[PDB]
């Protein structure tokens, strides 16, 4: 390993390389300036980013002594033996030559010394403090530490003299992922068709090891394509671009591996009608994520939130599924009342965790189904559980708009009762555009009928214009019910025909008779009361005009 292995973090490579080499190559220059250089550094960031890789690279390149300490390794069973091990390690490092200590997973050996209740750990941390600073603290040695939770360290340890400089090895950028891909594809044999720039563009949240996993999976796919051993096949493997596309369509970022959504298969042509709303959604989701130069040219941040509201079954969850399946950004599908818990504060803890994942693996889209379940009005409930719902809605308000970074979080809410939402959520900045999804008209009902009948054989003379003209107040769900009834009658006809045939293909299409006699029980789901309620809500929204 070397400096050509660690990729995507130029600043951190330069900072650590200078800090570790320059005071060990030109000490006279630092005697000329007068001050000593920083001597302790803590690398922190999400897992699988390159902290241990950087430590390995430094150990391999720098010719000085290198001593490695895994966290738990220091502790032992006999009393006062762990501190003896730490003292022995420091003495061995100091005595022979100028050296670099590397402490991997410092969180195991450096608790907060305030929430812990043990004894040996508190003496081991105190011994570490004395060794790092005090009478005869340390000479011509440097200390590197690696951690995943920098907040789990006692602050007394993170002061100048012990760990003065904090390097943040975080998630890469598009250029960083491209560079990492170029590093990881430097040894395999690739076909000419592969284009790493597009692949890096579509890898929206992959960090470090994620890229390596993707490459490995692609290679394995290639291995299992040309294995259905002679050198003829040993040579000319040729990892195609299709292999990479398949591996990218299969893998997901490890951060979201906890909340991976089930693979539902819908497409945009499955959504009948609502063409302008579909284009609006496309415009609001794909522009910030693909074209940031123009947004920075105008010097404005993009619009993020959106709220669908309308009668039930008009297609809100259908739009959400379409977004989940046919968009490059990651998807976090979150249920309404799933995030609540019996304990005290665990609802807001879960909400914070979900939004932390969303902001970590950005660009990300989070779908809030039935927003009125967790985000209702505040203080209306007299008999409550201690105002837990109130705290939940306040947590949502601060998390969607607070002391955050506003990098890329797209919140879509879907509720059919837009009067029960807290007005503090409807203001621009959190859910800034409210899209009404009205009942389909005739040209939308025909489109819907084609959308759900695109995988169904029908009689050639079956025209759907009559069905569209005949359904007036129906919704997409009602048209779905009509087609389902027609199909079930067709199935019944097929079954009885087969029974007749075996008594001693019968039906290849849905007949006009099947549709006509399945249209007997057709029904409009939304009553006039609900329709008038939604119309009044829209007219009250327009009353401001």
């Amino acid at each position: 390993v070397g400096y050509d292995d660690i990729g995507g973090c130029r600043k951190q490579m330069a900072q650590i390389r200078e800090m570790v080499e320059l005071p060990l190559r030109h000490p006279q220059l630092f005697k000329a300036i007068g001050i000593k250089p920083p001597r302790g550094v803590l690398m922190y960031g999400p897992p699988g980013t390159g902290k241990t890789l950087m430590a390995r690279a430094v150990a391999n390149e720098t010719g000085a002594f290198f001593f490695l300490i895994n966290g738990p390794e220091v502790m032992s069973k006999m009393a006062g033996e762990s501190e003896s091990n730490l003292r022995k390690a420091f003495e061995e490092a100091e005595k022979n030559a100028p050296a670099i200590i590397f402490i991997d997973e410092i969180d195991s050996i450096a608790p907060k010394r305030d929430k812990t209740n043990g004894e040996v750990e508190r003496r081991v941390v105190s011994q570490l403090l004395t060794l790092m600073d005090g009478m005869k603290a340390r000479s011509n040695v440097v200390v590197i530490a690696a951690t995943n939770r920098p907040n789990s360290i006692d602050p007394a340890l993170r002061r100048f003299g012990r760990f003065d400089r904090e390097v943040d090895i975080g998630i890469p950028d598009a250029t960083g992922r491209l560079e990492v891909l170029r590093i990881h594809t430097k040894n395999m044999k690739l076909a000419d068709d592969v284009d790493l720039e597009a692949l890096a563009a579509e890898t929206h949240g992959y960090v470090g090891a994620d890229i390596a996993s993707l490459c490995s999976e692609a290679a394995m796919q290639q291995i299992r394509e040309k294995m259905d051993i002679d050198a003829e096949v040993l040579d000319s493997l040729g990892v195609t671009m299709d292999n990479f596309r398949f591996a990218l369509g299969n893998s997901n970022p490890s951060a979201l591996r906890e909340t991976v959504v089930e693979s539902v298969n819908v497409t945009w042509d499955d959504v009948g009608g609502l063409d302008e709303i579909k284009e609006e959604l496309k415009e609001t989701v794909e522009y910030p994520v693909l074209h940031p130069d123009q947004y920075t040219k105008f010097g404005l941040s993009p619009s993020k939130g959106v709220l669908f509201y309308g009668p039930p079954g008009t297609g809100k969850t259908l739009l959400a599924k379409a977004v989940a399946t046919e968009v490059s950004a990651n998807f976090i599908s979150v249920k309404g009342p799933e995030l609540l818990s019996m304990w005290y504060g665990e609802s807001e803890s879960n909400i914070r965790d979900i939004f932390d994942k969303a902001r970590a693996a950005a660009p990300t889209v989070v779908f809030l189904d039935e927003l009125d379940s967790i985000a209702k009005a505040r203080g209306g409930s007299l008999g409550d559980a201690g105002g837990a719902s109130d705290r939940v809605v306040n947590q949502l308000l601060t998390e969607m708009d607070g002391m955050n970074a506003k990098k890329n979080v797209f919140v879509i809410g879907a509720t059919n009762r837009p009067d029960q939402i807290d007005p503090a959520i409807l203001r621009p900045g959190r859910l800034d555009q409210l899209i009404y999804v009205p009942l389909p008209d005739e040209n939308a009902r025909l489109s819907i009928l084609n959308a759900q009948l695109r995988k169904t054989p029908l009689e050639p003379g079956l025209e759907l214009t009559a069905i569209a003209k005949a359904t007036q107040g129906f919704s997409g769900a009602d048209l779905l019910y009509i087609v389902q009834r027609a199909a079930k009658y067709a199935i019944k006809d097929s079954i009885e025909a087969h029974r007749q045939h075996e008594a001693e293909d019968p039906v290849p299409y849905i007949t006009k008779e099947h549709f006509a006699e399945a249209m007997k029980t057709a029904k409009r789901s939304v009553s006039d009361a609900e329709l008038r309620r939604y119309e009044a809500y829209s007219q009250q929204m327009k009353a401001s005009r």
Partner: peptide, 23 residues
């Protein structure tokens, strides 16, 4: 010679309940 020993006993949590009013 002496020896050390580890111990992890328990923890205690707090729950939240819902009540019903009669207007």
């Amino acid at each position: 010679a002496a020896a050390a020993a580890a111990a992890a006993a328990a923890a205690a949590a707090v729950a939240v309940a819902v009540a019903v009013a009669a207007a």
